[PDB]
């Protein structure tokens, strides 16, 4: 579909809780595998768009792919991540600040988006997260969370305040339905 251009920062939970066997092989394997399927379907639905990839692991944020318009980098990054796995606990504030820094640069008619896959219950960051949520809504950076079996209130407020997309996933079939809803474009 053509009409406008999207910028989306995909954020994945690489904490020790993502190792667990509850969701196929383990959550890390099932999420990266479906996320590869989503990238190719989103870029096919959205030919003029961009994505960037971030992870939170071992109480830090790391850039798996830089912000770009070629899908190939993002499926190659999701392939390369699976081997190095997950350990430790999130860093959501530092991941929303690097994502903010890239998204603030983008011009007037393009969307600003953050997609988070969340299997934790809090985050390790000292900084005041409420100041950063207020700043996302001023900047027009929209944040969505797909949580695994989890409703912990600061994350849910953070996705509502920034635009209205806190979703729960209980199977591999439900996670493919949720990512496929996100493939869908915005109005122009």
């Amino acid at each position: 579909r053509l009409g406008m251009m999207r910028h989306l920062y995909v954020v994945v939970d690489g904490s020790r809780t993502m190792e667990d066997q509850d969701l196929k092989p383990n959550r890390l394997t099932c999420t990266l595998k479906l996320l590869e399927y989503f990238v190719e379907e989103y870029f096919d639905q959205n030919p003029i768009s961009q994505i960037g990839i971030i992870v939170t692991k071992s109480k830090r944020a790391e850039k798996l792919t830089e912000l770009s318009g070629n899908p190939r980098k993002h499926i190659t990054s999701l392939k390369k991540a699976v081997d190095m796995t997950c350990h430790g606990e999130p860093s959501l504030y530092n991941s929303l600040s690097i994502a903010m820094q890239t998204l603030k640069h983008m011009p007037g008619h393009t969307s600003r988006e953050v997609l988070i896959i969340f299997s934790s219950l809090t985050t390790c960051d000292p900084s005041n997260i409420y100041d950063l949520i207020k700043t996302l809504k001023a900047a027009k950076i929209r944040v969505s969370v797909i949580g695994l079996s989890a409703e912990v209130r600061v994350c849910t407020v953070l996705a509502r305040e920034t635009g209205g997309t806190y979703h729960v996933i209980l199977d591999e079939s439900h996670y493919k339905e949720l990512l496929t809803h996100h493939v869908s474009p915005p109005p122009a």
Binding site: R1, L2, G3, D44, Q45, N46, P47
Partner: protein, 193 residues
């Protein structure tokens, strides 16, 4: 067979076929494909439209009908061959017009079917031509209508670069294939979609 299926085939008439140097062969192959499609199930139907340089025209409108379909197609195309819009006199084709016709037909067939149960339809484009800026609004209008309708638009690009069609498949959730080896046309039609 429970679900009625309408497959509309839009054939790009553009004189690019000259580059193809054959149209006659392409028709023969398309006919074989149609016959197979109709044979697969009772409930399958086919509509064929030509997207020509100047305008879009209906070649044909069931498998029992196939003999009728073959004659109607051969005759219709021959009429199309006219000199105007010759060679790359006109690079583009009126796909927007063809798609509009296709959606109208699908809609009409659907209403009748509505009396009954649901119908499934998809549109296949055999695209020789190039897209143009002027074309953008009209084509996209039809494309978006199809997407909303949830009607997939598949495209087989024998040659040329129709970006809009590539975009059309993506939005529509259809399939787009740029064919290497155009003579393999029959395989692509059967296999590809």
């Amino acid at each position: 067979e429970d679900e009625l299926n309408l497959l509309v085939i839009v054939v790009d008439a553009n004189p690019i076929w000259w580059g193809k140097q054959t149209l006659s062969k392409c028709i023969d192959a398309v006919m074989v494909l149609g016959n197979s499609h109709l044979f697969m199930n009772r409930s399958n139907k086919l509509a064929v439209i030509a997207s020509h340089i100047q305008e879009s025209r209906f070649l044909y409108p069931k498998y029992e009908l196939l003999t009728s379909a073959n004659e109607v197609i051969v005759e219709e195309i021959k009429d199309l061959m006219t000199k105007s819009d010759i060679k790359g006199q006109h690079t583009e084709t009126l796909l927007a017009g063809s798609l509009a016709k296709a959606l109208c037909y699908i809609h009409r067939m659907n209403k009748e079917v509505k009396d009954n149960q649901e119908m499934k339809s998809r549109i296949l484009v055999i695209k020789a031509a190039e897209d143009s800026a002027l074309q953008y609004m009209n084509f996209m209008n039809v494309i978006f209508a199809a997407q909303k309708q949830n009607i997939l638009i598949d495209a087989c690009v024998l040659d040329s670069d129709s970006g809009l069609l590539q975009q059309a498949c993506d939005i529509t959730g259809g399939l787009y294939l740029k064919v290497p080896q155009m003579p393999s046309l029959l395989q692509y039609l059967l296999w590809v979609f």
